Design a protein around this nucleic acid. Structure first.
Ligand SMILES: [Zn+2]
Length: 251
DNA sequence: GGTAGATCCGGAC
DNA sequence: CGTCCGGATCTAC
């Protein structure tokens, strides 16, 4: 899921697990667990902790417990569900947190691609994967001035810049293509080639696109007419990713 | 120290 | 049906 979907998950999941105490943690694909390296240690440390909150940073969910934070990334296909311990698990369930009330928080992923890290709460923000995360795209800390500073110091494309999690947190491939289209900027443009007016227009569209979705012009629309000018949308590879643009609207 | 390339994964061509 | 593809490391020029 993208950042707006992660925010929805954070909002809806919290009341379903807040105040529940972990009684067991079952791990069916150990590779999901990244810290501690031993999944038996990951399971053992969670037991007896109560869920106190749920925050989001970028596309990461941070489950706040008594002493620990569990930091979770779903990638494209991960999903959480809260359900009864009496019912059969859905396919591709890799990690289950069993609560003392007979309910469970279940993690499901066909692609087996998500990650989980557990640290003492106070350590979480200074260790992987949160450690070098950039500002929230909807926060004042992400300003056109911060964006200009990163753009001018790199040789990379503007698309590669926006994909960099140290520049802005959790801004997905879909939103990068959509924001660049709305801003009228080609995704292959060197980031340092952007004018001051382009930078602020880009920031503005980034904030609008992501802000709208939390409260498509190009992505996946290749070979189809641009909704603004009727030019067929093109697809290319930029920064190793599928990249969608209108070659007339974007410059 | 910036940055491309390697790495993980399975459903879909 | 070997290869393609997302995000965010981690590795190593
Ligand atoms: Zn157009």
């Amino acid at each position: 899921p993208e950042l707006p979907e992660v925010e929805t998950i954070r909002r809806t999941l919290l009341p379903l697990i807040v105040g529940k105490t972990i009684e067991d943690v079952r791990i069916f694909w150990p590779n999901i667990i990244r810290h501690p390296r031993d999944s038996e240690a990951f399971a053992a440390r969670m037991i007896g902790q109560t869920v106190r909150g749920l925050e989001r940073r970028g596309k990461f969910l941070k489950f706040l417990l008594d002493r620990d934070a569990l930091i979770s990334h779903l990638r494209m296909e991960g999903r959480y569900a809260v359900a009864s311990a009496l019912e059969p698990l859905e396919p591709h369930t890799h990690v289950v947190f069993c609560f003392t009330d007979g309910s469970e928080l279940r993690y499901r992923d066909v692609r087996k691609f998500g990650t989980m890290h557990v640290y003492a709460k106070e350590e979480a923000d200074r260790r992987p994967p949160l450690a070098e995360l950039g500002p929230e795209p909807l926060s004042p800390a992400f300003s056109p001035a911060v964006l200009a500073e990163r753009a001018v110091k790199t040789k990379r494309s503007v698309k590669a810049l926006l994909l960099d999690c140290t520049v802005v947190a959790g801004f997905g491939n879909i939103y990068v293509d959509e924001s660049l289209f709305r801003a009228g900027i080609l995704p292959g443009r060197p980031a340092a080639s952007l004018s001051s007016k382009e930078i602020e227009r880009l920031h503005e569209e980034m904030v609008a696109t992501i802000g709208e979705a939390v409260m498509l012009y190009v992505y996946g629309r290749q070979g189809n007419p641009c909704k603004r000018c009727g030019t067929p949308i093109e697809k290319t590879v930029v920064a190793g990713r599928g990249t969608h643009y209108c070659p007339r609207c974007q410059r």
